[PDB]
Write an enzyme that holds these catalytic residues in place. Structure first.
Site, PDB file in Angstrom:
ATOM      1  N   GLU A   1       0.943  -1.192  -0.133  1.00 12.83           N
ATOM      2  CA  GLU A   1      -0.094   0.044   0.019  1.00 12.83           C
ATOM      3  C   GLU A   1       0.786   1.210   0.033  1.00 12.83           C
ATOM      4  OE1 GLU A   1      -3.840  -1.877  -0.146  1.00 12.83           O
ATOM      5  OE2 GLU A   1      -3.056   0.082  -0.628  1.00 12.83           O
TER       6      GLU A   1
ATOM      7  N   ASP B   1      -6.001   6.515  -4.889  1.00 12.51           N
ATOM      8  CA  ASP B   1      -5.567   5.090  -5.060  1.00 12.51           C
ATOM      9  C   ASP B   1      -5.663   4.597  -6.560  1.00 12.51           C
ATOM     10  OD1 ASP B   1      -8.425   3.241  -3.732  1.00 12.51           O
ATOM     11  OD2 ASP B   1      -8.288   4.195  -5.423  1.00 12.51           O
TER      12      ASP B   1
ATOM     13  N   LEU C   1      -8.518   4.194   2.760  1.00 14.03           N
ATOM     14  CA  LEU C   1      -9.743   4.581   1.761  1.00 14.03           C
ATOM     15  C   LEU C   1     -10.435   5.520   2.628  1.00 14.03           C
ATOM     16  CD1 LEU C   1     -11.125   4.461  -0.957  1.00 14.03           C
ATOM     17  CD2 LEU C   1     -12.424   2.543   0.134  1.00 14.03           C
TER      18      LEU C   1
ATOM     19  N   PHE D   1      -8.223  -6.463   2.735  1.00 16.94           N
ATOM     20  CA  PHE D   1      -7.917  -4.870   2.937  1.00 16.94           C
ATOM     21  C   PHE D   1      -8.158  -4.242   1.523  1.00 16.94           C
ATOM     22  CE2 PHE D   1      -5.520  -2.200   5.635  1.00 16.94           C
ATOM     23  CZ  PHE D   1      -4.919  -1.176   4.633  1.00 16.94           C
TER      24      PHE D   1
ATOM     25  N   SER E   1     -12.322 -19.784  -6.026  1.00 16.11           N
ATOM     26  CA  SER E   1     -10.774 -19.620  -5.583  1.00 16.11           C
ATOM     27  C   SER E   1     -10.731 -20.172  -4.201  1.00 16.11           C
ATOM     28  CB  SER E   1     -10.192 -18.333  -5.805  1.00 16.11           C
ATOM     29  OG  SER E   1     -10.018 -17.963  -7.053  1.00 16.11           O
TER      30      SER E   1
ATOM     31  N   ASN F   1      -6.683 -20.095 -10.729  1.00 17.00           N
ATOM     32  CA  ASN F   1      -8.013 -19.629 -10.736  1.00 17.00           C
ATOM     33  C   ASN F   1      -8.122 -18.074 -10.062  1.00 17.00           C
ATOM     34  OD1 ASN F   1     -11.117 -19.207  -8.967  1.00 17.00           O
ATOM     35  ND2 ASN F   1     -11.038 -20.446 -10.922  1.00 17.00           N
TER      36      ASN F   1
END
Ligand code: MTN
Length: 164
Positions: free
Chosen positions: A11, A20, A32, A104, A117, A132
């Site tokens: 990040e 972002d 965020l 996250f 998945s 996948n």
């Protein structure tokens, strides 16, 4: 390496409001603020989050505080989610970190719909799961980060974050 160090790599750390990868106002270590296109809306979220009138700038300690809250919230979210908790509980600690990283980034609902998945991960079919996981908007839009997270799921090691 641990989930904090991993997400700090993925990040970054910026102390002023920035957009972002999706164009959304963010601050700190991937906090965020809002999906609203209004900068004023984003500042208001920031001041509420920090508890003071910031006008868009925070300190490193404040960024780390929001980051700790956001990691904790991602984990708590996984453990409250009927689709994510069983997979999380089935994983080793390194792969748990990879699942926290995905939540996250894209949110609980977002990851909980990776159902095929998630089933492969529960089955510990790691190479299949990795294939996948890459068949996703997530991989296409942030491929370097997704490759690191996928490598972490495939191998259960931190090799993708070594030397970062
Ligand atoms: S996300 C829910 C889910 C769908 C299906 C692929 C059948 N699964 O095995 C689980 C429960 C993961």
């Amino acid at each position: 390496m641990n989930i904090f160090e991993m997400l700090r790599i993925d990040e970054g750390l910026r102390l002023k409001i920035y957009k972002d990868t999706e164009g959304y106002y963010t601050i700190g270590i991937g906090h965020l603020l809002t999906k609203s296109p209004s900068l004023n809306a984003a500042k208001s979220e920031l001041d509420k989050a920090i508890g003071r009138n910031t006008n868009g700038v925070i300190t490193k300690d404040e960024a780390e505080k929001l980051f700790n809250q956001d990691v904790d919230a991602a984990v708590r979210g996984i453990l409250r989610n009927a689709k994510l908790k069983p997979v999380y509980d089935s994983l080793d600690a390194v792969r748990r970190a990879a699942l926290i990283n995905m939540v996250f980034q894209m949110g609980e609902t977002g990851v909980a719909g990776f159902c095929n998945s998630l089933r492969m991960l529960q089955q510990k079919r790691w190479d299949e799961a990795a294939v996948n996981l890459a068949k996703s908007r997530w991989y296409n839009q942030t491929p370097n980060r997704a490759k690191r997270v996928i490598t972490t799921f495939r191998t259960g090691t931190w090799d993708a974050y070594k030397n970062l």
